[PDB]
Scaffold this active site. Structure first.
Site, PDB file in Angstrom:
ATOM      1  N   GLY A 118       0.814  -1.189   0.000  1.00 46.73           N
ATOM      2  CA  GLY A 118       0.000   0.000   0.000  1.00 46.73           C
ATOM      3  C   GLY A 118       0.848   1.240   0.000  1.00 46.73           C
ATOM      4  O   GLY A 118       0.875   1.980  -0.994  1.00 46.73           O
ATOM      5  N   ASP A 119       1.589   1.464   1.084  1.00 46.44           N
ATOM      6  CA  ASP A 119       2.331   2.705   1.186  1.00 46.44           C
ATOM      7  C   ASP A 119       3.792   2.611   0.713  1.00 46.44           C
ATOM      8  O   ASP A 119       4.548   3.567   0.882  1.00 46.44           O
ATOM      9  CB  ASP A 119       2.263   3.218   2.611  1.00 46.44           C
ATOM     10  CG  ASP A 119       0.992   4.039   2.864  1.00 46.44           C
ATOM     11  OD1 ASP A 119       0.599   4.210   4.025  1.00 46.44           O
ATOM     12  OD2 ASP A 119       0.409   4.502   1.873  1.00 46.44           O
TER      13      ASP A 119
HETATM   14 CA   LIG Z   1      -0.698   2.790  -2.772  1.00 41.51          CA
HETATM   15 CA   LIG Z   2      -1.447   5.715   3.290  1.00 42.80          CA
HETATM   16 CA   LIG Z   3      -1.063   5.086  -0.142  1.00 45.52          CA
END
Ligand SMILES: [Ca+2]
Ligand SMILES: [Ca+2]
Ligand SMILES: [Ca+2]
Lengths: 161, 161
Positions: free
Chosen positions: B16-17
């Site tokens: 995700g990040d």
């Molecule tokens: Ca992402």
């Molecule tokens: Ca995030």
């Molecule tokens: Ca993100």
DNA sequence: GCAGGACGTCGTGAGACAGCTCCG
DNA sequence: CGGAGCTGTCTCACGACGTCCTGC
């Protein structure tokens, strides 16, 4: 049903590309208390990775709503409601980190919601936790939510208290 | 060391990040092939959540470099090099979804790095896999990488081949 | 001559909703 | 009314590097 490393992945992703939030929505059609409290978790991603949502939605018993395109080419997945959520959140909380508090607050609301519906007083306590969650999803330098303040006034200036 | 749901969470969050990338860096001081190939994974986040990076970093064996602030108020954690990555990736690969291919491409690169070093031919294969990862990290509608083409010609026009 | 770490950044891919509509 | 799904968006928080800098 949901496996552990499967649950911890989802928690990891939710914590990155996801959201746990609560909002106070206007209900003109309602009687006394004209606001339903909404609860949700969501995952967000570029439409071309949609199948990865589909995945996380299948493993979660297919609760919630998949959207291949919000309109701006972004795809998402939202799970509304205490029903889906009372079943989903508890599987995730143990692995959630960044958004654990938010999740624990959602459950908190779910556990208080029943008796909060027709008790304007207990409903204020509920609305407080809506402020807490929204606040959690803010930088400490932004305006802080105030549904509680803005609704106690509407309450008082209306008889309910 | 690294527990399963712990690696699954991290996989989820990296998906995700985070980021798995490879890049062809120039080295004016090298003799023949004046390019080191760089490999990394990183995690990105707002600096008010640094402790969740600290966390993941502690969980991996304190390999990599935490950065409480890049300069634009965003914190990040970056793991360079085959040494950390040959240790870290394998733990993560089984729970990675979105970036799993990237992760394998990095291992593949680490597998050929040794002999590719002084072999202009085998360096070109290894360079192709760099094009492949950067390609993965792109929409299918942007210019595709080609350090391969730009390095073949260079080699040719310089005698290496 | 080699490789690991720091510094800075353009460009979106997200987040966290507000508002709308529909349901029995 | 009571809850739950669909529509659209401002505002950043990320991604995926390029680039300079170390030290031996
Ligand atoms: Ca992402
Ligand atoms: Ca995030
Ligand atoms: Ca993100």
């Amino acid at each position: 049903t949901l496996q552990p490393t499967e649950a911890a992945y989802i928690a990891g992703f939710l914590d990155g590309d996801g959201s746990i939030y609560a909002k106070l929505e206007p209900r003109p059609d309602y009687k006394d208390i004209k606001y339903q409290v909404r609860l949700a978790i969501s995952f967000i991603q570029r439409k071309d990775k949609f199948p990865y949502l589909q995945d996380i939605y299948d493993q979660l018993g297919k609760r919630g709503n998949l959207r291949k395109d919000r309109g701006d080419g972004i795809a998402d997945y939202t799970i509304y409601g205490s029903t889906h959520l009372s079943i989903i959140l508890p599987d995730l909380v143990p692995y959630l980190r960044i958004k654990k508090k938010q999740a624990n607050r959602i459950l908190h609301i779910i556990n208080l919601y029943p008796q909060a519906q027709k008790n304007p007083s207990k409903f204020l306590d509920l609305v407080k936790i809506v402020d807490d969650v929204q606040n959690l999803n803010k930088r400490a330098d932004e305006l802080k939510s105030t549904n509680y303040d803005r609704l106690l006034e509407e309450f008082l200036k209306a008889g309910k208290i």
